[PDB]
């Protein structure tokens, strides 16, 4: 109806992080008709713009409200896995931390044309940094805004840094500088523009919405890719969607000749939509009567997510009032005047903060790269599940109660060995996917050992004189949790997502039978169909996954518009 009579050079499934970048670069020269289909609404919420409002976005109408299958290995629990549902996608709901990981993460992919040397210029092209000038590892004119966080806890941030030095960890002045080792303590940069969320809707899509060759539909739920098995190969025709929920008319958007469908529905929904389109393991598609168009074992396999647990500790009575919770709320749960004024006057203070933007990468046992990320928060968790405690914090407003002053250290397995999957529970494309994070399932128990040693690392730091000054005991996991078996059980009962999720449409070399896309991001066995989102990441880098997604989308845009090739090798003689 809004597409009837139209032919598109690109149809982007989803309007999230990658889709905003592609919509921008693919529509730039004016010759190509680009359509964006996003299930969620327009990006207008004040809770998106204010970083501390991340607390309100969890479990909100701007989230998918996805829950895993029951996890036997995690005390028989379903795990909440937050996912953005609006233009900008998860970039509009994330903790804004800016991480590329280490050079070793990209070289470990072992995919021709996607080495660390290959991807570095695509990170740099995307970047404008308020705190790092141009050089080997930083750019200065790209659409992303990156900056040092504009909130500092004067007592607790320096106490965390002094405590990390007292236990012998070295500082890392730039977690994105590949000329030195990834390990150390320091400050995480953030995807913010003077304390306002700089999501990819704001940085890439919103500025170009006036382009006549660019059509963006919201409230548009894609139900499948339309694929024709005519000539002698499967050919994408376009995509089916509803603008009116499960009961809506199935509309079809149509490709112009030479048109491509680009999957941008992210590491949960892209493999889900591919399976609904006939692209996936034939046995899974046959289960729900889906005709097999491309029998691809890898679709929805290799789900990688970075699992988290935490410690938390109150400050002494004499240090009541010094936590970020005291800077945001007064003793009655009223938003502080000073915080509102500092945010609105010059984009500073507690409302600029996502909480978890100082920390460390740590090797728990002589690994080639750090297995542990630490996120220090100068406020005290009231739940061992950090995401639950952020939801509690949002609901705390105006309750007339005092949030107790303290600290938290979240421990993340940042290069996990466990994998999970995404598949189908039902034939209905409006139904939640069958979601299995796979936390703590690796054969050697490596991921559990990382989180157990992380808790020992956080306890060592909290015991150090620098942080001991402020603290008065431990709330989580608490004095009942001491032996390795007690810690392991605390972890199983409290483990939560640090909200990565990659690898479900794994990019791979020729000869890699687990791959879903080639090094050109084309889906095996279909013409005019690509995946450009976190799905394609072969092996998850250390640290949060947003910046790698934007890099992949920048490089894919350059490839599709003929400004770059991928691979590399001279022809053999």
Ligand X SMILES: Cc1cc2nc3c(=O)[nH]c(=O)nc-3n(C[C@H](O)[C@H](O)[C@H](O)COP(=O)(O)OP(=O)(O)OC[C@H]3O[C@@H](n4cnc5c(N)ncnc54)[C@H](O)[C@@H]3O)c2cc1C
Ligand Y SMILES: CCCCCCCCCCCCCCCCC
Ligand Z SMILES: CCCCCCCCCCCCCCCCCC(=O)O
* Residues 430 and 470 sit within 8 Å (Cβ to Cβ): no
Residue 140 in marked binding region? no
Q: Which two tokens stand for residue 45?
A: 């919420």
Q: Over the range 258-291, which residues count as b (16 or more CB within 10 Å of their CB) and which as e? A: ebbbbbbbbbbbbbbbbbbbbbbbbebbeeeebe
Task: Return the residue of 13, 377, 422, 449 that touches ligand Y, per CB under 6 A.
Answer: 377
Mask for 41-80, x = binds ligand Z (CB under 6 A): -----x--xx-xx-xx------------------------
* Residues 360 and 185 sit within 8 Å (Cβ to Cβ): yes
Residue 345 in marked binding region? no
* Residues 369 and 182 sit within 8 Å (Cβ to Cβ): yes
Q: Does 216 bind ligand X (CB under 6 A)?
A: no
Cis, peptide link before residue 568, omega less than 30° from 0: yes
Q: Name residues whose C-beta falls within 8 Å of residue 51's C-beta, 6 or more positions apart in sequence.
A: 96, 190, 192, 195, 196, 197, 351, 352, 353, 354
Q: Does 94 bind ligand X (CB under 6 A)?
A: yes
467: three-class secondary structure by DSSP: helix
Q: Are strands 496-497 and 307-314 parallel, antiparallel or unpaired?
A: antiparallel
Q: Over the range 42-70, which residues count as b (16 or more CB within 10 Å of their CB) and which as e? A: ebebebbbbbbbbbbbbebebbbebebbe
User: What secondary structure letter does DSSP report for 369?
Assistant: S
Minimum distance, C-beta of residue 323 to ligand Y, in the bound complex (Å): 7
Question: Which of ligand X, ligand Y, ligand Z, none does residue 46 bind to, with CB < 5 to 8 Å depending on kind?
Answer: ligand Z
Question: Which of ligand Z, ligand Y, ligand X, none does residue 83 bind to, with CB < 5 to 8 Å depending on kind?
Answer: ligand X
Task: Return the residue of 264, 324, 374, 435 that touches ligand Y, per CB under 6 A.
Answer: 324
Question: Which of ligand Y, ligand X, ligand Z, none does residue 503 bind to, with CB < 5 to 8 Å depending on kind?
Answer: none
380-419 residues in contact with ligand Y (CB under 6 A) are 380-381, 386-387, 389-390, 393, 408, 410
Task: Return the residue of 45, 55, 71, 90 that touches ligand X, per CB under 6 A.
Answer: 90
* Dist CA 557 CA 23 (whole Å): 9
Residue 38 in marked binding region? yes
Minimum distance, C-beta of residue 350 to ligand Z, in the bound complex (Å): 8
Question: Which of ligand X, ligand Y, ligand Z, none does residue 394 bind to, with CB < 5 to 8 Å depending on kind?
Answer: ligand Z
Q: Give strand pairing partners of 295.
A: 280
Residues near ligand X (CB under 6 A), total: 39
* Residues 421 and 303 sit within 8 Å (Cβ to Cβ): yes
Q: Does 82 bind ligand X (CB under 6 A)?
A: yes
197-226 residues in contact with ligand Z (CB under 6 A) are none
CA-based nearest residue to 269, from 535, 549, 548: 535
Mask for 275-314, x = binds ligand Y (CB under 6 A): -----------------------------------x----
Choose between 122 and 439: whose C-beta lies nearer to ligand Y.
439
Q: Name residues whose C-beta falls within 8 Å of residue 471's C-beta, 6 or more positions apart in sequence.
A: 313, 314, 315, 316, 406, 407, 462
242-271 residues in contact with ligand X (CB under 6 A) are 264-267, 269
User: What secondary structure letter does DSSP report for 432?
Assistant: P
Residue 128 in marked binding region? no
Residue 561 in marked binding region? no
Cis, peptide link before residue 567, omega less than 30° from 0: no
Choose between 231 and 345: whose C-beta lies nearer to ligand Z.
345
Task: Return the residue of 26, 102, 356, 531 that touches ligand Y, per CB under 6 A.
Answer: 356
Task: Return the residue of 25, 85, 157, 415 that touches ligand X, per CB under 6 A.
Answer: 85
152: number of CA atoms within 13 Å, CB side? 11
Minimum distance, C-beta of residue 284 to ligand X, in the bound complex (Å): 18
Choose between 381 and 526: whose C-beta lies nearer to ligand Y.
381
Mask for 45-64, x = binds ligand Y (CB under 6 A): -------x-xx---------
* Residues 446 and 240 sit within 8 Å (Cβ to Cβ): no
Minimum distance, C-beta of residue 48 to ligand Z, in the bound complex (Å): 9
Residue 331 in marked binding region? no
List, in sequence order, the alpha helices (H) in 193-248: 200
| Number of other CB atoms surrounding residue 253 within 10 Å | 26
Cα 58 → chain centroid: 14
Residues near ligand Y (CB under 6 A), total: 22
CA-based nearest residue to 98, from 134, 51, 145: 145
* Dist CA 89 CA 83 (whole Å): 7
Residue with tokens 């990819």: 200
Stretch that binds ligand X, among 85-93, 308-316, 331-339, 471-479 (CB under 6 A): 85-93
Q: Name residues whose C-beta falls within 8 Å of residue 398's C-beta, 6 or more positions apart in sequence.
A: 332, 333, 334
Residue 311 in marked binding region? no
Mask for 532-551, x = binds ligand X (CB under 6 A): -xx---------xxxx-x--
Residue 381 in marked binding region? no
List, in sequence order, the alpha helices (H) in 396-521: 446-463, 465-468, 484-494
> Annotated binding site: which residue ranges?
17-18, 38, 86, 90, 94-97, 222, 356, 375, 390, 410, 546
> Annotated binding site for hexadecanoate: which residue ranges?
356, 375, 390, 410
Interface residues toward ligand Y, by CB under 6 A = 52, 54-55, 310, 324-325, 353-356, 375, 377, 379-381, 386-387, 389-390, 393, 408, 410
Interface residues toward ligand Z, by CB under 6 A = 46, 49-50, 52-53, 55-56, 196, 328, 335, 340, 344, 351, 393-394
Interface residues toward ligand X, by CB under 6 A = 13-18, 37-40, 82-85, 89-91, 93-97, 221-222, 264-267, 269, 273, 499-500, 533-534, 544-547, 549
């Amino acid at each position: 109806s809004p597409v009837a009579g139209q032919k598109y050079d690109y149809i982007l499934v989803g309007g999230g992080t990658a889709a905003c970048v592609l919509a921008n670069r693919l529509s730039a020269d004016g010759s190509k008709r680009v359509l964006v289909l996003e299930a969620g609404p327009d990006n207008t919420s004040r809770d998106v713009k204010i970083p501390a409002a991340i607390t309100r976005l969890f479990r909100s109408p701007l989230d998918w409200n996805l829950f895993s299958e029951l996890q036997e290995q995690l005390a028989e629990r379903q795990i909440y896995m937050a996912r953005g549902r609006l233009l900008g996608g998860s970039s509009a709901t994330n903790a804004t931390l800016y991480h590329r990981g280490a050079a070793g993460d990209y070289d470990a992919w072992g995919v021709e044309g996607w080495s660390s040397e290959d991807v570095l210029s695509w990170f740099v092209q995307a970047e404008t940094n308020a705190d790092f000038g141009p050089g080997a590892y930083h750019g200065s004119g790209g659409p992303m805004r990156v900056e040092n966080p504009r909130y500092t806890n004067k007592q607790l941030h320096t106490a965390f840094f002094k405590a990390a030095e007292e236990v012998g960890l070295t500082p890392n002045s730039d977690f994105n500088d590949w000329s030195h080792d990834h390990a150390g303590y320091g400050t995480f940069q953030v995807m913010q523009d003077k304390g306002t969320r700089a999501d990819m809707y704001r940085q890439y899509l919103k500025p170009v919405l006036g382009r006549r060759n660019l059509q963006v539909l919201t409230g548009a739920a894609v139900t499948k890719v339309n694929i024709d098995q005519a000539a002698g190969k499967a050919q994408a025709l376009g995509v089916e969607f509803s603008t009116d929920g499960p009961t809506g008319e199935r509309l079809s958007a149509e490709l112009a000749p030479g048109g491509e469908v680009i999957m941008c529905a992210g590491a949960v929904h892209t493999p889900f939509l591919l399976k609904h389109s006939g692209v996936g393991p034939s046995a899974e598609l046959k289960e729900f009567g889906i005709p097999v168009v491309s029998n691809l074992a890898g679709v929805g396999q290799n789900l990688q997510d970075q699992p988290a647990c935490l410690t938390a500790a109150p400050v002494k009575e004499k240090y009541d009032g010094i936590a970020i919770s005291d800077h945001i709320y007064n003793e009655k749960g009223q938003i502080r005047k000073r915080a509102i004024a500092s945010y609105l006057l010059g984009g500073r203070g507690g409302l600029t903060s996502t909480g978890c933007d100082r920390g460390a990468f740590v090797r728990t046992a002589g690994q080639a790269l750090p297995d542990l990320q630490v996120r220090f928060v100068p406020g005290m968790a009231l739940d061992p599940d950090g995401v639950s405690t952020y939801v509690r914090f949002a609901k705390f407003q105006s309750q007339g109660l005092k949030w107790p002053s303290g600290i938290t250290m979240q421990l993340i397995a940042c290069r996990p060995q466990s994998t999970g999957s995404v598949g189908l529970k039902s034939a209905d494309p409006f139904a939640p996917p069958k979601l299995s994070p796979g936390y703590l399932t690796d054969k050697d128990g490596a991921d559990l050992a990382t989180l157990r040693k992380g808790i020992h690392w956080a306890r060592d730091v909290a015991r150090s004189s620098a942080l001991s000054e402020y603290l008065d005991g431990e709330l989580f996991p608490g004095s009942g949790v001491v032996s390795d078996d007690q810690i392991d059980e605390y972890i199983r009962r409290s483990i939560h997502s640090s909200n990565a999720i990659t690898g479900t449409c794994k990019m791979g070399n020729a000869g890699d039978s687990s791959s879903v896309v080639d090094n050109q991001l084309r889906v095996h066995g279909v013409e005019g169909l690509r995946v450009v989102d976190a799905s394609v990441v072969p092996k998850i880098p250390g640290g949060q996954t947003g910046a790698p997604v934007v890099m992949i989308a920048e490089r894919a845009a350059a490839l599709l518009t003929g400004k770059a090739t991928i691979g590399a090798s001279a022809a053999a003689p």
